[PDB]
Design an enzyme around this catalytic site. Sequence first.
Site, mmCIF file in Angstrom:
data_model
loop_
_atom_site.group_PDB
_atom_site.id
_atom_site.type_symbol
_atom_site.label_atom_id
_atom_site.label_comp_id
_atom_site.label_asym_id
_atom_site.label_seq_id
_atom_site.Cartn_x
_atom_site.Cartn_y
_atom_site.Cartn_z
ATOM 1 N N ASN C 73 4.585 7.224 14.213
ATOM 2 C CA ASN C 73 4.914 8.039 15.374
ATOM 3 C C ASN C 73 6.267 7.591 15.948
ATOM 4 O O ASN C 73 6.390 6.476 16.477
ATOM 5 C CB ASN C 73 3.809 7.943 16.432
ATOM 6 C CG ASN C 73 4.156 8.701 17.712
ATOM 7 O OD1 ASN C 73 3.970 9.918 17.806
ATOM 8 N ND2 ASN C 73 4.675 7.977 18.706
ATOM 9 N N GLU C 74 7.282 8.444 15.803
ATOM 10 C CA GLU C 74 8.612 8.230 16.414
ATOM 11 C C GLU C 74 9.334 6.932 15.982
ATOM 12 O O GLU C 74 9.968 6.264 16.790
ATOM 13 C CB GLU C 74 8.508 8.291 17.958
ATOM 14 C CG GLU C 74 7.955 9.651 18.461
ATOM 15 C CD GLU C 74 7.978 9.806 19.972
ATOM 16 O OE1 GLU C 74 8.157 8.781 20.647
ATOM 17 O OE2 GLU C 74 7.817 10.964 20.472
ATOM 18 N N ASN C 122 7.259 15.858 17.804
ATOM 19 C CA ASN C 122 6.898 15.733 19.207
ATOM 20 C C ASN C 122 7.971 16.471 19.987
ATOM 21 O O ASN C 122 9.128 16.040 19.977
ATOM 22 C CB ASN C 122 6.820 14.241 19.612
ATOM 23 C CG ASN C 122 5.765 13.480 18.815
ATOM 24 O OD1 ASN C 122 4.823 14.084 18.308
ATOM 25 N ND2 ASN C 122 5.904 12.147 18.725
ATOM 26 N N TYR C 128 11.454 17.529 29.039
ATOM 27 C CA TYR C 128 12.464 16.479 29.007
ATOM 28 C C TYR C 128 13.863 17.106 28.867
ATOM 29 O O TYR C 128 14.750 16.539 28.248
ATOM 30 C CB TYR C 128 12.213 15.481 27.871
ATOM 31 C CG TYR C 128 11.127 14.433 28.137
ATOM 32 C CD1 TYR C 128 10.170 14.136 27.163
ATOM 33 C CD2 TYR C 128 11.087 13.718 29.332
ATOM 34 C CE1 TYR C 128 9.184 13.166 27.380
ATOM 35 C CE2 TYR C 128 10.100 12.747 29.560
ATOM 36 C CZ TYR C 128 9.150 12.489 28.570
ATOM 37 O OH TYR C 128 8.163 11.544 28.762
ATOM 38 N N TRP C 207 0.005 17.148 24.116
ATOM 39 C CA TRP C 207 0.091 15.816 24.707
ATOM 40 C C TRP C 207 -0.034 16.011 26.213
ATOM 41 O O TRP C 207 0.896 16.533 26.821
ATOM 42 C CB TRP C 207 1.430 15.163 24.351
ATOM 43 C CG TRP C 207 1.440 13.697 24.645
ATOM 44 C CD1 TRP C 207 2.073 13.067 25.687
ATOM 45 C CD2 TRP C 207 0.780 12.668 23.885
ATOM 46 N NE1 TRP C 207 1.843 11.701 25.619
ATOM 47 C CE2 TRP C 207 1.064 11.433 24.519
ATOM 48 C CE3 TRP C 207 -0.009 12.672 22.728
ATOM 49 C CZ2 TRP C 207 0.582 10.204 24.026
ATOM 50 C CZ3 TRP C 207 -0.502 11.444 22.232
ATOM 51 C CH2 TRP C 207 -0.198 10.232 22.882
ATOM 52 N N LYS C 228 0.642 13.643 31.727
ATOM 53 C CA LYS C 228 0.745 14.893 30.970
ATOM 54 C C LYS C 228 -0.625 15.429 30.562
ATOM 55 O O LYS C 228 -0.714 16.412 29.814
ATOM 56 C CB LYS C 228 1.637 14.698 29.752
ATOM 57 C CG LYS C 228 3.065 14.332 30.168
ATOM 58 C CD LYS C 228 3.997 14.333 28.965
ATOM 59 C CE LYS C 228 5.407 13.856 29.319
ATOM 60 N NZ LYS C 228 5.380 12.434 29.787
#
Lengths: 655, 655, 335
Positions: C73-74, C122, C128, C207, C228
Site C-alpha cells: 500500500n503506497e 488510492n 486532498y 476509505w 473518513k
Amino acid sequence: SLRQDILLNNNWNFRFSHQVQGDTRRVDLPHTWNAQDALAGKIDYKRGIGNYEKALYIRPEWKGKRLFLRFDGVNSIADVFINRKHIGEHRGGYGAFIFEITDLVKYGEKNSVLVRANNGEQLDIMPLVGDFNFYGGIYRDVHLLITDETCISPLDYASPGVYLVQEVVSPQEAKVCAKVNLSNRAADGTAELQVLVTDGTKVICKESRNVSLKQGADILEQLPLLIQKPRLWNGCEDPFMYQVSISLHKDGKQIDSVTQPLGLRYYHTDPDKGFFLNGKHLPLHGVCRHQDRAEVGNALRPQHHEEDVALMREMGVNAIRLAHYPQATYMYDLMDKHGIVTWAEIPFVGPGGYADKGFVDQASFRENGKQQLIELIRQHYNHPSICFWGLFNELKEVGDNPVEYVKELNALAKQEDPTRPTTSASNQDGNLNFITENIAWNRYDGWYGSTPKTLATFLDRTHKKHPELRIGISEYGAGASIYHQQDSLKQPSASGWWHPENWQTYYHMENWKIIAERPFVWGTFVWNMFDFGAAHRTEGDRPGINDKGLVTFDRKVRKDAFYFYKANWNKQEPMIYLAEKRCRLRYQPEQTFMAFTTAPEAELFVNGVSCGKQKADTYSTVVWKNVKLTSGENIIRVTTPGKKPLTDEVTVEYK
Amino acid sequence: SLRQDILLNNNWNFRFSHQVQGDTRRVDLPHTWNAQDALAGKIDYKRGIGNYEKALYIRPEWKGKRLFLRFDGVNSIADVFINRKHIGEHRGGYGAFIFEITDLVKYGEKNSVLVRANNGEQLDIMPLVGDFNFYGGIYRDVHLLITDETCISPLDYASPGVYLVQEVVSPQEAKVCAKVNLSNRAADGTAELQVLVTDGTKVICKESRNVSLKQGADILEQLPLLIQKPRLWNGCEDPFMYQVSISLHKDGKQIDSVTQPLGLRYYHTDPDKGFFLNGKHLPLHGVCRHQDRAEVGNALRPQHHEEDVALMREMGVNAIRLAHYPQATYMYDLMDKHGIVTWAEIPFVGPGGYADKGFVDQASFRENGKQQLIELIRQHYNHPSICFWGLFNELKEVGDNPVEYVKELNALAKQEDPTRPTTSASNQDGNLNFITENIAWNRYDGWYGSTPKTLATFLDRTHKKHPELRIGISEYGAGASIYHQQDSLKQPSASGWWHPENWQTYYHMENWKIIAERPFVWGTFVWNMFDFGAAHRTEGDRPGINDKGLVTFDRKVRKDAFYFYKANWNKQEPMIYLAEKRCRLRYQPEQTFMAFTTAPEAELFVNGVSCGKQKADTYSTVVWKNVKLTSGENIIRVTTPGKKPLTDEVTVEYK
Amino acid sequence: RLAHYPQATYMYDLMDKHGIVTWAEIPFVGPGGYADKGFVDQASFRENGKQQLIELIRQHYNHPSICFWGLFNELKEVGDNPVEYVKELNALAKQEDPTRPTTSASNQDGNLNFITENIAWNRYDGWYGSTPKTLATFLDRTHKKHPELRIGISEYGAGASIYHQQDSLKQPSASGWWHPENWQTYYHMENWKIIAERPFVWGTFVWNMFDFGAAHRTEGDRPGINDKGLVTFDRKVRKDAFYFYKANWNKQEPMIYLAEKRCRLRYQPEQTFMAFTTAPEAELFVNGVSCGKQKADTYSTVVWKNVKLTSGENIIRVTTPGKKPLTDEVTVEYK
Ligand SMILES: O=C(O)[C@H]1CNC[C@@H](O)[C@@H]1O
Ligand SMILES: O=C(O)[C@H]1CNC[C@@H](O)[C@@H]1O
C-alpha cells in the site's frame, strides 16, 4: 526573655491535590515542585496546588508568649491552616507574609500546620506573563517567631516593624526618623522604647521614650535621630553600615529587641551626567540576576546567593537589577554588605515579543499590585543598597492600557518612600516612559536584529529629543552556548538552535564601547549575569533555557564575555584571559588571537615560539593577527610582562 | 421590534496561555480543552487558561438597541474583553452570566470579543474536590442578545428576568405572583407591561400595568395572577404547562417580549409515607446523571441531552438528581416536558473517600458559594420539574466545619425561593444531616464493603431513631464493565481492575427490593444512569472512568441492570430481556438463566427444545435452574406467551 | 478490503458466511504524504516480509471470501527502491497460492503498478485537492493508455465530523479543524456517479467504513482520528453518506432517509431538502403542509428546491408513497 526565630524547614509531608488518595512524601524546604518539569522545557509544567503538612510541638513554656508563622516566600497563593482550620491567605509569590497563631494553638501538644500552595494561572496576581518560570511552592524559609506579649510588631506587611527614614544625609550630619511599630497584648500599662545606634562597640545614638500601650494597641512611634559627621555607605568604596538595636524594656528588663542596619547615603540622577552617590559621579556597571539555578529551580540555599554575589564581585559588578520581582532578604543583605547599588522591582511584567498582557484592568489585579508594591517597600525599606524602586517591565498600551494605573503605583511608591526614586524598564515608545523618575530601556541591537550601532543612535536621539529624561539601559545582551563554537564570526538567528559563543563576546564588546562613551546613561544592566530557566524557550543548545548569561545556569562556567567585563571593571586584580579557548578546532588560514588583560601589553607564543608583544587597547583587549598555525595540534600561550607573569594557555587543532 | 438571540458558537480562534507565541487554531463551541487528556485518565490534565477570540460585526442598525453577551457556562473563571479592554469577570463553572456591551462597541465595524477561560485549581470557587472532571472552557452556548432600550431585564443573575412565584396551588385555584425585572435606558416616560397566560390558543390570564420608568431605572414589578380550576403539572401522568408571554408596549407597539413556562403544582414530603405530588403519593424512581459523555467531555450538543432523556424515559425513570452542579437550561426544559421530578444542586462537593476538603472557611469561598446558589435559583426558577434545591454532597465536619455555613445557605435558599424545599446528599452521621428540609444518604452497601442487607438496617434504624427526618437515598450503585464477564457470582474488589457485570445486576436487584418495601424513603437515585469521567479512577476495564452507569459512557450499551429497572418501572411497554447474554462462555455444570419481563411468565428454549414455562416474580424476574447445556454451542431463547410473542436470544459456548 | 494487515480469523469467517468478496493484505505500507519509508532494503526486513506473506496465505488459505492477496500500500521508488522485492513477493504469493490473484494499492505512477495481477489506486480527487471530476479523467486516461491493466480503486473518501454542520456547501481544507458533514456527502455522491458509469473498474473500496485511530492526525473535530468513516469510531452514528450508499446498494430493503438532519440551524433564504430512498418518489411536508412529490433520480436521491421556511422552528417530514409509508423527520430552526 529574648525573641526566638525558629526555622521550620525540615521534614514536611507533601502531595499534589491532583493526587487524590492522600498519601504523601517527605520534602524539605526551600522547595519547589517545578525543579524537574519546567527545567526540562516542559511548557505546560505543573501549575496548581501542592500541599505541605508538618506537626509542630507547641511547648508549654511558650504559653504567655506571642507566636507567629512567618513565610519568606510562597509562589503564588498560600492558604494556611492550623489544626486544619483556615487562618489566612496570601496572594503574591515574592513578598513575605505572616500570621499570628498565639490563640489558635493547643499548648503542650502537637499542632498541625498545613500550607496549601497554588501556582496555577491567575489573572489577578502579577506577574501574569514573563520570560521565566513561575516555580511553585514554599521556595523560601518558614519561621516560627516567638515574642513577648508586648513587642516590636512583626505584623506590618511582615516587615521587621522598623523603618529608618533617611530624611537628610550629608557629610556634616544625618537626620533619621526611626519609625517603630509596637503591638501590645499585655494588660494596660507602659514600656520603655530604646533606639541604639552603634559602630562596633562605639555608641553613636541612644534615644529613649516611655510609651503607654492600651490592651490591643497597634501603634506607630517616631523617634528622631541625629548623627553628626556620619560615615556614609559609599558603594564598593566603603559599604559602611551602623547597627541599630530597637528594644522594649519593662522594669529595667529588656523584653524584646530587633536589629536593623543603617547605611546612610544621599544620591541623585542627572539627565546629562548620570548617577551621583554621596555627591560624587558613579558609573553603574550593572548586571541583572534571576533567583533560580540549575537543578534546584528557585529553591535557593544561602550558599547560592553567596556564590552569585562572589561571581559578580569577581567580575567588578557595582550595580544590580534584581529582576523581575522582590528577591530574598539575604540577597539584599549581601548587596548592602558588598556595596552594590541595587534596583529592586515588583513583578509587573509585560509580554515582550510573546502573547497576552502584563496588565488586566480589574480591581482585584490592581489592588493586588498595590499590595505587592507596599510589601516590597516596607519589607525591604532599610537596605542601603536599594537605590531605586522599579514599577514595571515591558508593559504596553494596546488593549488594557496601564498608563493611569502605573501613575497610581508611582504616587504610591513616593508616598511609601519619598527617599528613593522610582524607575522602570521599557521596550516601548510613548507615555509609559514619562511616569517614573528615572527611565530605562531593554535594548538588543545586534541580537534581536539590527547592529550594535543602532543602540548608539537610539541613545543619542532620545537624549537630544527628551533632555529631561534620566536614561538608563535596563537590559542588553546576547545568547551563547559554551558548546557552540566556530572559527569565524557570523551573526546567528536569535531564535535558532545555534548560539556560537563568539557572537556573544562580539556583542558585549561592541555594546560596552557605546555605553562607555555616554556618561548621560546613568546605569546599564547586562541581561543576564546567569543563564536562567524559561520553559517555553526553544533555542541555543537546549530547550527551556534563556542563554544570555555571562555565566552558565549551574554557575560552573564563565563565558568569554565575563572576562571582557572583568578586565575592564575589576582593574585592580591582575589577570590575563585568552578568548576562544573553547573553540578547539581551527580552520581559518589567518588566525586571530585575542586576550583580555589588566596589563598594558601581553606576549603570544605558538608552539613555544614567541610571536611578539601587542599593546592592550583602551578596553583591556590585546589582539594578534595573521598568526600561522601548523597542521594538527598547536599550543597557544599568552603571558603578561614582569618577572612573575600571568599566563593562559590552550591546545587547538588546525586543519 | 423583536428581541433577537444570536448564537455565537462558530469559528473562534483558540490558544492556551502556556503557548506563548500567539498563533491560534480554529475551535467551535461548545468546547472543552479536556476532552482528550482527562478522558484518557491523565490525572494532571490541563487546568489553566485557554483563550478564545472572535471578530464580531456590530451592524449599524443595532445602534439604538441594547446589546448583551450571554454565556450559558464557562468552567471555571471567565474574563471577557471587548476590543481587548476588560469588561468583566465571572467566577463559577456552571451558572450563566451576562455583560451588556451596548456602549463598549464600535457600530458598523468588526469588534474583537476575547474570552479568557481558566479551569486552574482555586480554593475560593466550589467545587474544590469531587469524583468527576473539571473540564475547562466555554462548554455551553454563547449568545448575542439584542433588545429595545426599554426591556424585560436580562441583567438579574443572567436569568430570564421573570419569576412566576407559585404562592398557592390547588385543584380549585392557583395564585401566582409574576415578578418582572424591567430595565430602562430610554428617556423618562412610560410603557405598558402585559403578562399573558395561555393554553395553546386559549387565553387564561391577561394582566396589564402602566409603568413609569426613569432613565437608568432597574426595577421590579409584581403582577398578581389568579387561575381558576387550573390544569396541574402532574409528573409523567400529565406534564402540563401553560405558556406565559411577558411583554412591553409603547404606543400600541410591542417593543420587547420574553416567554416562560408555568407548570403549576403543589407537593410535600411526609417522614413516614414519602413524596406527595398534587396531593397524591408518588414513589420517586430516580437516577443521577452527570453532564458529560465519551469523546466530547462536557461539550454536550442538544441531541446529547435529548438522547440521555430518551434512555431514562425508556427505563421508566420519573425522577432525577442532576448531580453535582447546575446543569443546562435545555436539560431542565426536557425534565419539564417529560414530567420528571428533579433535584437540582450547587457544586458544594466534599471529598468522599479521597483527600482534601469541600469547604475552605474564608470569605471569598463563602461569598462565592452564595452567588452560585442565587444563580441556580434565579436562573432556573420557573422549571416546574425542579422540586428540590440541593445544598451539598458529602461535606464533612473535620477541619473547617461547614455546618454553620450550610445553615446560611439553607436560609438563603428559603429566602430566594420559599416555594421549594431544600435537600442534601450526605455520607456522614451528625449535625450536617439536620439542616435541610429533606435529607438523603449516598449508600454503597454491597459495593464498597458489607452486603446490601445493611442498607435495610441503616434505613430502618435511622427512621426509628429520628422519626422527623424525611429520608431519601441520594446515591446507590455498583460498578460494571460490559467486557468483564464470569459464569459465577462473586463480589469483586471495588477498587480493582475486575468489575464483572453480573455483580452490578445482583447489587441493583437486591437494593431495589429493599427500597421497594420502604415507602418512608421519599426518593432513591441510582448512581449513575451513565458511566462518566473521573480522571483519577483506576478501576474496571480502563482508567479515568467511574463505571457505575446503567448505560455505557458513549450511551451505546445498556447494562443488564438497565433492563431490570425497565421491567419494573416501565410496566406498560411489553418486553422480555435475557440477562447475561454478554457472558458467552459457560462452564457451570448447572446453568441458571434469568429474564426480565413485563409478562406474567416466559418460556425457555435450549437448542430449539422447550425447557418449560416459569412465572415472573414480584420483581418481573423469571428464573430457570439446573439447565443442561451440551458441549460447544448452545442457542438459548426466551419467549413471552401469546399469539404474537416477544423473544430474546443468545448463543453461548459450554465447555 | 481488510486494510492494512492480516486480520482476525473470525473476521474472515464472517466474510465467508455473509458472502463478501475480500481483499486481504500484508502490512507492506508506505508513507503517503508523510515522512520516512515503507521499505528498508536489508535482508532482515525482506526475509521478515516474506514470512508475514507466507503466514497470511497459509493461515487464511481456506476462506472462500478471500479472492485477492494484497502485497503493498503506497510504496514509492525514491531512496530504497522496492520494485525488485515486490516482484519477489509476487512470485512467492503465486507459489504459495496459484488459486488467487495478487493485487496492490498504489498512490504512484510507474513500475510499481505493473507487478501484481490486478492493480488499484488510492484516489482523493475532491478531498486532498482538485475536484471529483479528475478521478474520471485519471480512470479513463489510464485505461486507454494501458489497456492490459485491471484497474480498481483501492481507496476513495472524504472526512466528516457529525458535529460540524453548515447550511451551505463549501469545500473545507483537508488538514484543518473543520470537516462539515455535507462535503463528505457531496464527495461520495459525485465519486459514486463516476464509478457507476465505468464497469472496467473491477472494484472500488470506500476509505473508510469507520472512523479510525491515527494518533498523529490533527484535523476534524478532535486530534488522533482519521474521520473518513461512513460511520463513527464508536460505531454509534451513521453519517449521511452511509444512507446514500444504502439506498443505492441495498435496494431490496425499503427506506427513506432525510439528509442534513444534523444541520439544525438554517439561514439560506432558499432551502434545499434531499432524501435518499428506495422508492420511485417521495413527498415533502413543511410544518404539516405538503410541498408536493418529487421523483427519485437514478441514484436514489429525491431533491426539493426553493423551500420556504418560516422564522423559528420548522418541522420537516418526508414520506414514501403507499398505504403504509415510511417517513423521516427533523425539526430545524430558521433565522
Ligand atoms: O528576550 C530576553 O531575553 C529578555 C527580553 N526582555 C525581558 C526579559 O525578561 C527577557 O528575558
Ligand atoms: O464513589 C462513587 O462512585 C460516588 C460516591 N459518592 C459521590 C459521587 O460523586 C461518587 O462518584
